[PDB]
Amino acid sequence: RAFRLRELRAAQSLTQVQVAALAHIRQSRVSSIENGDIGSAQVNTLRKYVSALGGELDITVRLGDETFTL
Template identity: 40%
Template sequence: MAKPFKNLRDKMSPQAQNASEEKAKKMLSEMPLQELRKARQLSQKNIAEVLSTEQANISRLEQRTDMYISTLRSYIEAMGGQLDIIARFPDGEVHISQFKEIESLQNSKSAQSSG
């Protein structure tokens, strides 16, 4: 019979508990798109409907190792998120903003073509 994790955790030293918690946080902060979608309790079909595409296309997208930023942004937004591109350097971080400008241009073009 399986024992509750809490029982095992209570027997761990405070250092081991802290190390376990840090590892869990790191694992949750870094995950592939497919795991992120599952963690948000969404199906490929849900994402496909929001993006007006087929489920098979979402499956292929989740397997890619290289894709357009606009494609990744659409996928993240379909899950209710927001994509932020950050460059990390030894002396600090920089949020890259030019992709937001591209999105604004795309939105205004699509508004003009539908109007």
């Protein structure tokens, strides 16, 4: 059900070089986070990389039965 974000940036036929250039972040950072690991990666870094695809990013927190965004 999880769709790691390399196969999501390929939904709209785009290349890392292109996502890294309107995100204004080193292609180093795209390769690492597009690889399959999103931990290392900052939030702002991630947020910028998703804004590139013309999407929005939401961090929702769930504990017991309460939910809200950061």
